[PDB]
Design an enzyme around this catalytic site. Structure first.
Site, mmCIF file in Angstrom:
data_model
loop_
_atom_site.group_PDB
_atom_site.id
_atom_site.type_symbol
_atom_site.label_atom_id
_atom_site.label_comp_id
_atom_site.label_asym_id
_atom_site.label_seq_id
_atom_site.Cartn_x
_atom_site.Cartn_y
_atom_site.Cartn_z
ATOM 1 N N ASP A 186 15.491 4.459 -12.790
ATOM 2 C CA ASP A 186 15.566 4.179 -12.977
ATOM 3 C C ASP A 186 13.950 3.841 -12.395
ATOM 4 O O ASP A 186 13.159 3.266 -11.238
ATOM 5 C CB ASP A 186 15.439 2.418 -13.140
ATOM 6 C CG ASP A 186 14.579 1.192 -14.175
ATOM 7 O OD1 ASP A 186 12.912 1.641 -14.448
ATOM 8 O OD2 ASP A 186 14.346 0.281 -13.636
ATOM 9 N N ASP B 181 8.107 5.038 -17.014
ATOM 10 C CA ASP B 181 9.427 3.812 -16.737
ATOM 11 C C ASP B 181 10.743 5.299 -17.772
ATOM 12 O O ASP B 181 10.573 4.592 -18.234
ATOM 13 C CB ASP B 181 8.958 3.070 -17.063
ATOM 14 C CG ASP B 181 10.251 1.742 -16.639
ATOM 15 O OD1 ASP B 181 11.045 2.404 -16.324
ATOM 16 O OD2 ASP B 181 9.638 0.758 -17.176
HETATM 17 C C1 VG0 Z 1 17.683 1.048 -21.359
HETATM 18 C C2 VG0 Z 1 17.256 0.099 -21.859
HETATM 19 N N1 VG0 Z 1 16.870 -0.922 -23.100
HETATM 20 C C3 VG0 Z 1 15.454 -1.735 -22.040
HETATM 21 C C4 VG0 Z 1 14.745 -1.652 -20.829
HETATM 22 C C5 VG0 Z 1 13.668 -1.928 -20.608
HETATM 23 C C6 VG0 Z 1 13.535 -3.130 -19.113
HETATM 24 O O1 VG0 Z 1 13.463 -3.723 -18.746
HETATM 25 N N2 VG0 Z 1 13.761 -2.042 -18.283
HETATM 26 C C7 VG0 Z 1 14.386 -2.258 -16.574
HETATM 27 C C8 VG0 Z 1 14.926 -1.526 -16.133
HETATM 28 C C9 VG0 Z 1 16.583 -1.802 -17.301
HETATM 29 C C10 VG0 Z 1 16.507 -3.560 -17.520
HETATM 30 C C11 VG0 Z 1 17.693 -3.599 -18.102
HETATM 31 C C12 VG0 Z 1 18.512 -3.104 -18.504
HETATM 32 C C13 VG0 Z 1 18.641 -1.447 -18.264
HETATM 33 C C14 VG0 Z 1 17.376 -1.237 -17.337
HETATM 34 C C15 VG0 Z 1 12.315 -1.413 -16.263
HETATM 35 O O2 VG0 Z 1 12.500 -1.350 -14.847
HETATM 36 C C16 VG0 Z 1 11.178 -1.766 -16.853
HETATM 37 N N3 VG0 Z 1 10.226 -1.938 -16.111
HETATM 38 C C17 VG0 Z 1 8.940 -2.085 -15.678
HETATM 39 C C18 VG0 Z 1 8.152 -2.715 -17.328
HETATM 40 C C19 VG0 Z 1 7.640 -1.640 -14.830
HETATM 41 C C20 VG0 Z 1 9.484 -3.885 -15.112
HETATM 42 C C21 VG0 Z 1 9.691 -3.113 -13.775
HETATM 43 C C22 VG0 Z 1 9.930 -5.046 -13.317
HETATM 44 C C23 VG0 Z 1 10.212 -5.287 -11.760
HETATM 45 C C24 VG0 Z 1 10.197 -6.012 -11.248
HETATM 46 C C25 VG0 Z 1 9.351 -4.352 -11.005
HETATM 47 C C26 VG0 Z 1 12.584 -2.629 -21.323
HETATM 48 C C27 VG0 Z 1 13.075 -2.084 -23.399
HETATM 49 N N4 VG0 Z 1 12.170 -2.808 -23.760
HETATM 50 C C28 VG0 Z 1 11.263 -3.951 -23.797
HETATM 51 C C29 VG0 Z 1 10.420 -3.527 -26.034
HETATM 52 C C30 VG0 Z 1 10.760 -2.468 -25.476
HETATM 53 C C31 VG0 Z 1 11.542 -1.939 -25.007
HETATM 54 O O3 VG0 Z 1 12.198 -0.298 -24.760
HETATM 55 C C32 VG0 Z 1 14.363 -1.617 -23.161
#
Ligand code: VG0
EC number: 3.4.23.46
Length: 373
Positions: free
Chosen positions: A32, A216
């Site tokens: 990630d 990301d």
């Molecule tokens: C792969 C799984 N699918 C997703 C994942 C995510 C999501 O939130 N991914 C996390 C990691 C993560 C979290 C849970 C499970 C796996 C990976 C990432 O770090 C966010 N980065 C950010 C955005 C930069 C936030 C980081 C926050 C930290 C506190 C720094 C969003 C999605 N979404 C939401 C709607 C559209 C879409 O595709 C679909």
């Protein structure tokens, strides 16, 4: 030997194999670039096939500090500690790194994803509880002779490669174009122009970066600021007007299906994202085909057809260039030179009429800074 060291399942993240503790406990960790905490399931959970057992690791050290991390999707809380970590199909080294032992979580782990942890590859500035918690890559570089750089080749079961410490020329074709990392926290970049089938969205370029734009790998969709998203959808609908889909589709809440092998790729436009170059007013563009933004949803029950979900969605936290955008491109995270490179991947998407591409250079007369802040 790091080629094809990534696996995954569409919309569920790409993961690499890692070991934590002594003796080594093998776990699949999601890659990630959108976060900076290295965390692993450390207790039983409905969707976990295995987890980190600290009691069995003689090299584990508890930091006596709890931690909470909320993502766009899901969140978890755990206990901080340190231990030895290695990457079987990566640099053959062992480093002591911070590890968050997840003991509680909500909508984080995914049923059947095949991974048990997450590797935040971004900078310390966004690490929780604070920036004093050194991220894994930083520890890796400091403790080993691994160059401060890594590249990702995500392919659309899925797979790919994470090259740590260098660039693998056999993973891409053509030229590598670099865009500056505006700020070292998220991998923040600047989009200077957006075109839908050659037609410019005609918008102050600052709108594309409100309040920031990032790369990301941990996010599935291409997420766009409300204003840009609405404009984009309007343009895509216009281009594909030969067929009408329910609003639920454009909202990413519903699947669209066609008889197997008959997806009308030609009615959907190519989306061009222009990224700021290394020289003033210069830029390059990466082209996204519908094969990328129309995410396939595998389901044996619906296998008489090919079904997809619209992988472009609205955001209120800026532009997020997720996995669907990275797929088909070789992306180099050159931390050493504060820049990110893009090149056409050996597993790029294409058909007989169009192909994903990385082209440049493009010039702009407008002297406006597209950066929002
Ligand atoms: C792969 C799984 N699918 C997703 C994942 C995510 C999501 O939130 N991914 C996390 C990691 C993560 C979290 C849970 C499970 C796996 C990976 C990432 O770090 C966010 N980065 C950010 C955005 C930069 C936030 C980081 C926050 C930290 C506190 C720094 C969003 C999605 N979404 C939401 C709607 C559209 C879409 O595709 C679909």
């Amino acid at each position: 030997e790091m080629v094809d060291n990534l696996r995954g399942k569409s919309g569920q993240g790409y993961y690499v194999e890692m070991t934590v503790g002594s003796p080594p406990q093998t776990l699949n960790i999601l890659v990630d670039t959108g976060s900076s905490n290295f965390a692993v399931g450390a207790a039983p959970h409905p969707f976990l096939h295995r987890y980190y057992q600290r009691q069995l690791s003689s090299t584990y050290r508890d930091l006596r500090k709890g931690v909470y991390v909320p993502y766009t999707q899901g969140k978890w809380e755990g206990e901080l500690g340190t231990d030895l970590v290695s990457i079987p199909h990566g640099p053959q080294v062992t480093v002591r790194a911070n590890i968050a032992a997840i003991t509680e979580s909500d909508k984080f782990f995914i049923q059947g994803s095949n991974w048990e942890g997450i590797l935040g590859l971004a900078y310390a500035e966004i690490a929780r509880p604070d920036d004093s918690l050194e991220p894994f890559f930083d520890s890796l570089v400091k403790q080993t002779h691994v160059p401060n750089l890594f590249s990702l080749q995500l392919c659309g079961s899925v797979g790919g490669s994470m090259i740590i410490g260098g660039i693998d020329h056999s993973l891409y074709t053509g030229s590598l174009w670099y865009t500056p990392i505006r700020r070292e926290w998220y991998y923040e970049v600047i989009i200077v122009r957006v075109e839908i089938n050659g037609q410019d969205l005609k918008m102050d370029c600052k709108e594309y970066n409100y309040d920031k734009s990032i790369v990301d790998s941990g996010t599935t969709n291409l997420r766009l600021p409300k204003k840009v998203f609405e404009a984009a959808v309007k343009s895509i609908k216009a281009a594909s007007s030969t067929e009408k889909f329910p609003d639920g589709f454009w909202l990413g809440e519903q699947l669209v299906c066609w008889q197997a092998g008959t997806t009308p790729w030609n009615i959907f436009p190519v989306i061009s994202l222009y990224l700021m170059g290394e020289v003033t007013q210069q830029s390059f563009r990466i082209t996204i085909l519908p094969q990328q933004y129309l995410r396939p949803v595998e389901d044996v029950a619906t296998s008489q057809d090919d079904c997809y979900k619209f992988a472009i969605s609205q955001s209120s936290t800026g532009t997020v260039m997720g996995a669907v955008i990275m797929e088909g491109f070789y992306v180099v995270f050159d931390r050493a030179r504060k820049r990110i490179g893009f090149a056409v991947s050996a597993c790029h998407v294409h058909d007989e009429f169009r192909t994903a591409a990385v082209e440049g250079p493009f010039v702009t007369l407008d002297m406006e800074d597209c950066g929002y802040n």
